[PDB]
Amino acid sequence: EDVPWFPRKISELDKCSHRVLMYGSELDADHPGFKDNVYRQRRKYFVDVAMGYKYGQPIPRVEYTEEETKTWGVVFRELSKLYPTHACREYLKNFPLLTKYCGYREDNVPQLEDVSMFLKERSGFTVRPVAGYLSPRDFLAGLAYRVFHCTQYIRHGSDPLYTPEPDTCHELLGHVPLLADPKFAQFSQEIGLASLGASDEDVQKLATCYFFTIEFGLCKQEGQLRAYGAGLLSSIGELKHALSDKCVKAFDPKTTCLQECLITTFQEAYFVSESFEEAKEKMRDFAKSITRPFSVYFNPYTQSIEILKDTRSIENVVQDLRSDLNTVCDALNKMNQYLGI
Amino acid sequence: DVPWFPRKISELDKCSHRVLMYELDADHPGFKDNVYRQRRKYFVDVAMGYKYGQPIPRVEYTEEETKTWGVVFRELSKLYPTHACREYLKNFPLLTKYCGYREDNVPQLEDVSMFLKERSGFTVRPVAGYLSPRDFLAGLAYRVFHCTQYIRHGSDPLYTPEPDTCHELLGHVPLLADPKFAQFSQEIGLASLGASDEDVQKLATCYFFTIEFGLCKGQLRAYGAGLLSSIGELKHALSDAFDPKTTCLQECLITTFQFVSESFEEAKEKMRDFAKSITRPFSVYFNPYTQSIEILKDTRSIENVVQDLRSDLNTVCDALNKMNQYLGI
Amino acid sequence: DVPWFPRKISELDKCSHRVLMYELDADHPGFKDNVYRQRRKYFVDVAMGYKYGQPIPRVEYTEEETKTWGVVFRELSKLYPTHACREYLKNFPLLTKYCGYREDNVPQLEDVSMFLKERSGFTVRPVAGYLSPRDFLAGLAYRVFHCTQYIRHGSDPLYTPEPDTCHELLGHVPLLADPKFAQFSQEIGLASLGASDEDVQKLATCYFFTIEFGLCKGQLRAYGAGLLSSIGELKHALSDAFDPKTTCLQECLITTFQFVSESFEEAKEKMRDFAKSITRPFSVYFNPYTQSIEILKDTRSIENVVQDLRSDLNTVCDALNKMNQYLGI
Amino acid sequence: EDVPWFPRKISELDKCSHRVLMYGSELDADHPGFKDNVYRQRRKYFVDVAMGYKYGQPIPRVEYTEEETKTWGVVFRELSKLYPTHACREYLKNFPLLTKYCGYREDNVPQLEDVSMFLKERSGFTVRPVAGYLSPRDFLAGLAYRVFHCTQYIRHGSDPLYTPEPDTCHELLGHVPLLADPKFAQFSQEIGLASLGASDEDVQKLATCYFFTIEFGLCKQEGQLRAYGAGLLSSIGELKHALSDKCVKAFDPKTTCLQECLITTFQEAYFVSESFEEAKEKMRDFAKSITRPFSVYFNPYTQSIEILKDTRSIENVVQDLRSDLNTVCDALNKMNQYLGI
C-alpha cells in the first residue's frame, strides 16, 4: 500500500505522540514569557516530563508552583461565573464530579493521571502529556484510540485571561469535562478514525472540522444556545461573544471544512449540532466520503485497528452484530417476563 | 436484590481476594518438604499483595522449580502436534518468541498478560487460592483469568494435585490468545453475573467440561486446559456433543477420568442461548471502553445498544462501498 | 449457468403449468364412475386456464361432491381439539366465520386466498396436476401454495388416493394462516431457488416431513397437513427431533406409515442454516414490495440490504423512545 | 386511544380515497373550463369513474378524446425539450422505460392500470384514480401503503402549458417517472407512515414537507443541480426558473415545514437533497420527533400496519432483523467461497 502510515496498535501511538513539530520550550517572539527565564525553565521542565512518558507508565504527577496555581485559580474563578449561563448541559453535569474526584478547585491544579482514570471509567478516554505541537495527522491518530494529548504547563502569569497557546487550563477546563460524555467521546473518536490512512488534504479537512466543533462548538440544548467548544470555555471574551446578539451556522461537515481557522481573531462563524449523537452520525457519513482503500473498525478489547478489506472480516463483524442483537432480545424478553410489557 | 457482582474492573479486586482456601493436606508433598512450603506462602503472600492497576510481579528464578518446569514443558510438547487443536499450535511458537517460553525458563505472568491483551483482550492476575465459582467466573466476564503463580513439587512432575503455573501457562494461556475462544469464555462469565448459585454451578460444570477439559473437531483434537496439562488423560481422551443444558447436569470427577464442539463461535452462541434460560431481572452488556458492566433493564439502555449497532452497520456499509470502489465487486 | 427459477411473481405462471402428470390409474375409483371423470377434467381444464392476476374461479356446487366434503369436515373435527396444535384451533373458527367453511358448503379458493393474504401474506392458486418439486417449492418462495380444486370420489370419504380440496383446505390452510409458519414455509421455497436437483429433493423430504406430515410440542400435537387430512395416521402419530441435515436422508413412504419441532421460529432458522450448506453461486433475498427475488452476488446488493436493516433498527429505536416517553420504562 | 383514525389494512384505505373534500366536477370561478359544458361532462365522467373504483378491482381504462390527446401531446412535446437539461438522473433513466412499456408517447395517453403494474414491479407503488382533493391526512395515508392517488382528467385545451390544478399530465409526467425509483419510493412511504395517527398540525408539517420535496424538489446529481419535484417537471416556466441564476436552500425537515405553500406564485425557495436515501433518513429522524403513542412498522406481506407499543412486537422485529443479517453472512460466505475475497 502507498497509504500514509498510521498506528495499528495502541502501543504504536507513541510514535505519534513524540513527533513534536514545535516544543513548548520554544516560545514565539510576541509571547509574554519570551524574556522570562524563570518561566522558560518551567516550560523546559514540562517538555522534559512529557518526553519521558511512554505507553504503560503512569502519567507523571508534577508539583505546580504557587504563582502557577494562582494563575490557574484566576482562570478557574472567572470562567466559573460564566459557566452556569454559557456552558452546555453536558458540561454542567460533569464539572461537579471533577471537583469531587479530580481536585478541580480554585486552589489546586488537577493531575493528568487523576483526570485520565476519571475519564477512562466514565467514557474510555485517557490523556497523555504532550511535549508540544503535533502534526494534525498524529494528533487525530490519538483520537482514534480515544487518547487526548494534553499540555501540562500553565500560561504566563502576566495575563491569566489571555493565552495564544493551549495550556493545562485549556485542557482541564475546556476539554476534559466534555470528554467525559460517552456520546461526545464517540464523536471525537469518529474524527480520529476518519483520519487514519487518509490524504493530507482530507486530514486537514478533518482538522478544520475538529477546530469548529471540539475547539469552538455551540450546541442547542432544551431550545437554548450553549457552548461546548473547548476554546470557547477557556476564553471568557470569546465565550461571551459566541452566545451574544451578533453569526451562527448549522454544523455540516462538507460545508464546515472549507472555512479558515484563525488563532488571534474572533472566529467568523460558530457551528451548531442538536446533539453529539448528531455530530457523530454527521461525521460517520463524512468518513465514508473520505478516500482510502479500506474501512477501519476499532477493537477496544485489543486496543488496535482492524482493517475491513475482505468479506471475512466484514462477516465477522456482522456475526458479532448478530449476537449483540440476541442480547437485545434477551433484555426485551426479561422485561416482558418481569413487567408484563 | 440480586447477588452482588463487580460492575467495574476495579471492583473485581474484591472477587480476587475472597479466597475460601489458600494450606496443604497430608497427601500433598508440601509438608514433607519444608523448603517447598516456605516458597508457597511467599507466592500466596504476593497474590494477596496484588491490587488492580499494578504490574504483575516477577518471581525469583529458582532452578529447582525451574528444572521441574522444564520436565513438564518438554514432555507435554511431544504430545501436542499429535493431540492439540490448531489454535494451540498457532499460539505456542509465538509464546516462545515473545513471552520467553523456553525449557530453561519460567514465564512471568506480566509477560504473558501483556501478550494476551494484544491478541484477545484477556489479562491474567495471580490468585492467592481457590475462589468461589461465582468470583472466578466474574473474572472471565472481564476477560481476566486468575492464575496460580506457584509450581508443583519436584518429587513427581507428571502428577499434579492442584492447579499450578505449568497448568495455567501450558494448558490455558495458548487458547486464551484466540479471539473466538476469548469471546466464548467471556460469555460464561457474563452469564454468571447476578445469577442464582445453582445456575452458577451449572455454568461451573459447563466451564469444567469445556475450558478445563474439552474437545473440538475433520479430525479430533483436545482443547481442554487440564488435558493439555495431563499427559495420561490427553491420550485417553483421543483414544477409544456439547449441549449446555444437557452438559451442566453431568458430575465433575476430581480423580477419575470422565464434549465435542465444532467451533468456538458455536460454543459462544450455544452459550448465549443458555443465558436466556438463566434467572435474573436483567440482561448484561459489556462495555470494553470503560471496562464495566451495563445493566439492560430499561428501554433507555436497550436503545443505546441498538443505536451503537446501527453505527457499526454503517461501517459495514462503508467497507462494502470501498470494496466495490476498488475491485468492482 | 444455474437451473432457471422465476425471479418475478408473474414468471411463476411458467412453474404452475409445467405439469408432469394431470389421468387416473386402475386403483382409483375414477374410471369406474364415468360421472366422476367428467368433472375432474373440467377442474383440470380450469387450472390450465388460470393466469396470474386473475381471480380464482368458483366451482359449481354439486351436492354429491359437497356431501362427500361434509363427511370429511365433520369426522376430522372431533379429532382436532385432542390432536391439533393451537395455531390450527386459532384459525379454524375464523375460517368458519369468513371463508364459509361449513358442513354443507365447500369453500372457494378465492375466499381462502384472500383470507391468507391478510393474515400471513400467503395466497393459493389452483394447480392442474402434480408439479416438479422444484416448481412447487418455487411457489413457496413467493408464499404461493398450489391447490387441487377437485374433491375425492364419494365411494370412500376416509381413504384418499391423491391430494384433494379436503386435504388442502382442512390440512394445509389453517396453518398457512400463521405468520411464523408462513415464514418457515417460504424459507424452504427460497432455499430451493437455483439449487441442484438433489438439494431440491433433500428439501422435498424436509418439506414432506414437516409441512405434509409433522409434529410440534409442554404437550405433543400434530401440525402435518397430511396428518390433519388422515384420521387413522393422526391417532397413530400421537400414539406410542427435527434436524434438516439428518431429516432429508430418511425415505418418503407413500402408503406405509413413517419429527418434533419446538416452534416454527426454530424450524425457520434451522432451515436458514441448511440454506448455507446448499450449493449455489448466490444467496437470495425476497422483495415483498415488488414481489420478486433479489440475487446477492455483489457488494452493491448486499449493502442495500444492510442499509435497509439500519433503517428498520431506527424504527426499533423510535418504538423504545416512545415506550419510555409514555410509561417511564 | 384518543388518536386520529388511520387505515390499518390496505383494504381500509378505500375510506381515505373516497373522502373527497372537493370533486373535480367542481370548477373554480377563474378556471378556464368554467363556461365549457363539453369540458364539464368530461370532468364529471372522470369523477364518476374514480368513485366507482374499489380495492381489488382493475384500474379502469378510459378512452381519451382527440383534443385531450393533443393537449397531452403539447405538454409532452414541450416538456421533453427541457428534460435532458433540467431533469434529474433518476428521471432520465426511467422515462424511456415508460415509453416502451406504458405507451408514453406524444400521440397516446397512458392508462393508470398500465402505469400501476409498471410501478408495482419496479418499486412497489400503485396508483389509484382519485375523484378530487383529499384531506392531507387521507392523501398521506395512501403513501404509507405506497399508493399514489392520481387525477385521470386532462387540463383544459384552452392553454396546455398552464394549469392551476393537478391533472393526469402532471401525474404521468411529473410524479410517475420518479415513483419508479426504489429509493424515492421508500422516501415517499416514510412521509406517509409518519402521518399515521399524528396531529393535524404535524400532518400539515408533513404536507408542507411533501410539497417542497415531491412537488418542488431539487437534487444535486454528479455535482450539478437537477429537478425532481413533480410540480417543476409539469411546469415549463417554473422549471426554467428553478435551475436558473436567481434562491436555493438545503433540504431540512424541521426548517422546511415552517414555510408557506403558494399555488399561483413561483415558490419562494427550492430545497435540495444530495440523494433520496438522504431525504429518507432525514425524514425517518423527523418521524421520531412526531408525537404519537406508538411507532408504526409496515408489513408488506399482509399490506397492513403493525403497531409497535410493547416488547413482544419489538423483539419480533429484532428477531427478523437477525435472520436477515444471517442471509447477509451467507452472501458474504458464498462470495469468499467463489471469488476468494
Ligand SMILES: CCn1c(=O)[nH]c(=O)c2c1nc(Cc1nc3ccccc3[nH]1)n2Cc1ccccc1
Ligand atoms: C487539530 C489541530 N491540532 C493539530 O493539528 N495539532 C495539534 O497538536 C493540536 C491541534 N489542536 C490542538 C489543541 C488545541 N486547542 C486549541 C485551542 C485554541 C487554539 C488552538 C488549539 N489547539 N493541538 C494540541 C496542541 C496544540 C498546540 C500546542 C500544543 C498542543
Ligand SMILES: CCn1c(=O)[nH]c(=O)c2c1nc(Cc1nc3ccccc3[nH]1)n2Cc1ccccc1
Ligand atoms: C470452575 C471451578 N473453579 C472454581 O469454582 N473456583 C476456582 O477458583 C477455580 C475453579 N477452577 C479453577 C482452575 C482449575 N483448573 C483445573 C484443572 C483441573 C481440575 C480442576 C481445575 N480447576 N479455579 C482456580 C483455582 C482452583 C484451585 C486452586 C486455585 C485456583
Ligand SMILES: CCn1c(=O)[nH]c(=O)c2c1nc(Cc1nc3ccccc3[nH]1)n2Cc1ccccc1
Ligand atoms: C414436495 C412433494 N411435491 C412435489 O414434489 N410436487 C408437487 O406437486 C407436490 C408435492 N407435494 C404436493 C402436495 C402433497 N400433499 C400430500 C399429502 C400426502 C402425501 C403427499 C402429498 N403431496 N404436491 C402437490 C400435488 C401433489 C400431487 C398431485 C397434485 C398436486
Ligand SMILES: CCn1c(=O)[nH]c(=O)c2c1nc(Cc1nc3ccccc3[nH]1)n2Cc1ccccc1
Ligand atoms: C399534500 C398536499 N395534498 C393534499 O393535502 N391533498 C391532496 O389531495 C393532494 C395534495 N397534493 C396533491 C397532488 C398535487 N400536485 C400538485 C402540484 C402542484 C400544486 C398542487 C399539487 N397537488 N393532492 C392530490 C390532488 C390535489 C388537488 C386536486 C386533486 C388531487
Ligand SMILES: [Fe+3]
Ligand atoms: Fe484544545
Ligand SMILES: [Fe+3]
Ligand atoms: Fe484450569
Ligand SMILES: [Fe+3]
Ligand atoms: Fe399436501
Ligand SMILES: [Fe+3]
Ligand atoms: Fe403532484
